Amino acid sequence: GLFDLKAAGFKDPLLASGTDGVGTKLKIAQLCNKHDTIGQDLVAMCVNDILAQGAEPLFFLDYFSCGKLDLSVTEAVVAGIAKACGKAGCALLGGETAEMPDMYPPGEYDLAGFAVGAMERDQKLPHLERITEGDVVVGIASSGLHSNGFSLVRKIVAKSSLQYSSPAPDGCGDQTLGDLLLTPTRIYSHSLLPVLRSGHVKAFAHITGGGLLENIPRVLPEKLGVDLDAQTWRIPRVFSWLQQEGHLSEEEMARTFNCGVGAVLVVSKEQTEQILRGIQQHKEEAWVIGSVVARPRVKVKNLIESMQINGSVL
Amino acid sequence: GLFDLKAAGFKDPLLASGTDGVGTKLKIAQLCNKHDTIGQDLVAMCVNDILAQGAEPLFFLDYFSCGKLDLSVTEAVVAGIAKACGKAGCALLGGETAEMPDMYPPGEYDLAGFAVGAMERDQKLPHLERITEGDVVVGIASSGLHSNGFSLVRKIVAKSSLQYSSPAPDGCGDQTLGDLLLTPTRIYSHSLLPVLRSGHVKAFAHITGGGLLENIPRVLPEKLGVDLDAQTWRIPRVFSWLQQEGHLSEEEMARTFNCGVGAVLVVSKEQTEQILRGIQQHKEEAWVIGSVVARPRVKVKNLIESMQINGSVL
């Protein structure tokens, strides 16, 4: 289909676009034959990425390249993408499935996603000029691992006392380890857009590859960093299991995983309360996780302490 | 970057989009270590596809997923994409390279491309209501194989008396067989847009997967087909070499390969001459290759005859 910006109600739009992939999270989907929500990871990654620029997602396309797959696997992938597009509030405008046995072994596939969004010229983000020392960092809860760090995840599972089919560790639901690890990326595009539209968000960072350390600097003025404290948010228990199993340092955790924070907003102190109110009303979970500070550029205090499980508590 | 439709000069745009891939043409690039023009295949595929809807390409994004690659291979891929975008006249707005050793063996990569275009509401194609029996089919020359049929190509080379490093067969240039097979897809977006903008093109089909037989019906009214005659265009010699080596039937050739025709236009008889004049002035090559007829939906007369090399002619 062709997209009609006028019918969509834009007066003077700028267009944002981005491409993303699920990474080796797909290998776990393929190992466990659990493909229903991998389309949500793909769509969420693309729409959350353009949300960061201040854009409302308009439409999405995927390129689905694969070895020989079961009919039921091909269908489950594609249906989950359609489902995720409905959830995000964007149109599935096209796609391609390209079967290439010489490129991929039986049962393996890759996904590339593309999303296009739009906003008014004045609705654009970040507003770098507005960001100052003492500004507040708001963290939005992730659903878990989202779609990054899965090369490390798969290495840890491979040497662990648990298999993907094992019960998920203490405090990770009545599901298998595979189910837990496959928990789909949260879509923030529909719930957080009115919050961005308030005009009191100075910047938005979607937390993806490179974790908290790599993604936050991209939306800060050159001379500023951020001081974060991990005691101020809830760390999903999957991150504790992983740290313990792989004996992971703070740095490794902060560079690889979202650690519970799927997205960050920069807001002034004065505007903090109404932002938190706005987020809560749109059914997301959020905390003040730190502050913008003079100038490591991002510091994550108390990460291991905050996620380490007390061995005398059952 | 963000795209500014206003600055670009659109009054009332519709947006066209599409995703495409190079297919197993990439395997030949990887086998021969010849990656300089694979980016042109990718970009050409995406821009020629939106050209078909009547759109001017605005911008392009790629997702580049790979095993461990040489630094020089990664760079050559990416530079060829940048180069192709300049040629097509569209902006390279973004991209991602995702190295995943567990997904791809050393030296193997895949490409997904995404292009967005725009045109006026009245500049849209096809104009299905306008197409009638007796309308003319204009064929635009391909540069060769373009980017489809490469699973069959690689099978034929694998059993042939020629290797990719062998001299290219009689009448295929002073280059290797690999060089010939890698000849990049022609970009039609910059040269053929003014022709589409004339308002005398009823429809455009880019000839890709499924060849002449699959791609032309998509732009015809339900009750109409097309009668083509292969004696009316030049068939590049690569197609003769392939037919002979694989002992390929007319049907196999017409369903797999473009056979010399990279794109088709539907035009009225009255408007034929000025269209041919328009194409020639924009430095493309074209012929009247057939006509729209009542209702196999697409017929390709004289394909093997027209491409068979006379054995008594040296």
From Swiss-Prot, chains A, B:
Sequence segments annotated as region (AIRS domain): 1-314
Residue list for modification Phosphothreonine: 208
Subunit structure: Homodimer.
The record's note on its domains: The N-terminal ATP-grasp domain carries the phosphoribosylamine--glycine ligase activity.
Function: Trifunctional enzyme that catalyzes three distinct reactions as part of the 'de novo' inosine monophosphate biosynthetic pathway.
Family: In the N-terminal section; belongs to the GARS family. In the central section; belongs to the AIR synthase family.
The protein's name: Trifunctional purine biosynthetic protein adenosine-3
Gene: GART
Residues included from the entire protein: 475 to 792 of 1010
